[PDB]
Amino acid sequence: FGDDTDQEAVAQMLDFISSQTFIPILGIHGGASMIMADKDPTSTFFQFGASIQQQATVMLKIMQDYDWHVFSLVTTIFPGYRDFISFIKTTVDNSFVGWDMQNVITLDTSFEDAKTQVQLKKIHSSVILLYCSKDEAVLILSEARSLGLTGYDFFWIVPSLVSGNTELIPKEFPSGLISVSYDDWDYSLEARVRDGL
Amino acid sequence: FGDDTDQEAVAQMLDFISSQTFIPILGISGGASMIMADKDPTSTFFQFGASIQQQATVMLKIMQDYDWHVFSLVTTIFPGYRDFISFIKTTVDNSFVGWDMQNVITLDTSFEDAKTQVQLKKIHSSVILLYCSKDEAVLILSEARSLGLTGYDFFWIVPSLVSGNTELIPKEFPSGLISVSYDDWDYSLEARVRDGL
């Protein structure tokens, strides 16, 4: 099954089905393909996608190939972020580049634009990594547009969970927003299910 | 003439009396000595107070004595603001400091908190000069606290246009606001009128 909407927990529901039916279940598209945290040992659920570590490797390879070195790191309390920051820290620890890293800007809650605003104003660097859900991404990018953090030197590289469906490109996104996903329209759904079968 | 109220135009009324009776008139305090802009050669009226230019000179001396070299100038559309901005620019041009000065951010109308929010989010510095009336200074400080611009590292220095009555202190005034006024309670009213005589 491949989902068309942007609800990842559907796949989690399918994950529970893979905990109960003992059937190998392949998440294919959309919210059925979105990466969850930890698949169960009794589960036989498998997704056609990459890890967050391989996708972070791809994003840092982009930053290495395009020489954007002084960066920041902004996450919310949407989970799966601690291992992401740990992978970035170990990548800096395994770096012959000599990366520069502004410290981690976290967010307390859904932002009141009171305490997170001073945290965002600490940033005056070029490239910012943002890791949150898609509506929260719209809210944070609207805040950065209000803060003027969407300029020419102000780049944004986001994972696939920020992007989601390629058929829907919502508002408040900069014309030049850098995203890394795997929802290729050329790589057809028929080829997906044929390879799975 | 002395006064303890906040009706400045009475002194201007005395100025009209000074336009007609050809009598030197002195204003002590209250509304009798609040600063009017330009006197007349047909007038002989005088106040006992300090002009907004001399008060700005005192405030810039205060800002120089703590080496707070970075500031932002914020005014409303309350009149007298153009002379205020021009005097501050000519004083910075005649200053040995080399003020790392963020530009001047004003307002246009009664705020929707939509464009004025974008105007207030431009400040990432610490010291802010604010020239506005008392009816809107509470709104500005409440919006700055709502935007986190009333932080611990930040500073706020205002003239006597907001700091009027000693009793009327709302909750929105941050504890740490520095103001400048010529109401010297160490000198009594009788000493002032004896000096005038």
Partner: protein, 193 residues
């Protein structure tokens, strides 16, 4: 009294009063204005950090040091600009009238040298704010009936948070406080002609 007037009719030397809003939510007179210059009751400028009840943080550091000519050069303010030059940082000194009186004033002065640049690079990296001030108690440190003098007494009685200035390290100082990693080979030495 020279209460003279201008062509604009304002007073040449008026009476300016610089007030604050303290934590007691009332106006407090602080700064007075002379015929030309400013005088401040609180030359020491504190935080006034409790603007409201939502402030738990802490970044200022009360830092004491001591005059040593190759490490801490202490000079007056520059009379041309009334401003410390850009490498020098502000400080204060508690100077009295004479030896018989017991009250003094904290006169602002400038500092440069070796440890000043160390403290500035630390404030670059560790990203904190600092309040530089000298000590008038005396020398580095000497236990006078379980009471240390100078900088060490200010650290033990905790009116000084840390002493970033130049300071020798021996056994009893390492007993009473804690030091950092060393940064300069400074043993002893003897001078002759």
């Amino acid at each position: 009294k020279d209460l003279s007037f201008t062509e604009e009719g304002y007073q040449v030397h008026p009476r300016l009063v610089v007030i604050v809003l303290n934590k007691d939510r009332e106006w407090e007179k602080v700064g007075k204005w002379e015929n030309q210059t400013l005088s401040l009751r609180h030359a020491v400028w504190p935080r006034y950090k409790s603007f409201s009840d939502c402030e738990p943080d802490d970044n200022h550091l009360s830092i004491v040091t001591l005059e040593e000519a190759p490490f801490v050069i202490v000079e007056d303010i520059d009379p041309l600009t009334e401003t410390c030059v850009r490498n020098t940082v502000p400080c204060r000194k508690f100077v009295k009238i004479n030896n018989s009186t017991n009250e003094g004033m904290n006169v602002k002065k400038c500092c440069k040298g070796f440890c000043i640049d160390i403290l500035k690079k630390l404030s670059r990296t560790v990203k904190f704010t600092y309040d530089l001030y000298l000590v008038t108690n005396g020398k580095h440190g000497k236990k006078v009936n379980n009471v240390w003098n100078g900088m060490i007494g200010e650290v033990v009685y905790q009116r000084a948070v840390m002493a970033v200035g130049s300071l020798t390290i021996n056994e009893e100082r390492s007993e009473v406080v804690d030091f950092s990693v060393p940064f300069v080979e400074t043993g002893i030495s003897v001078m002759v002609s």
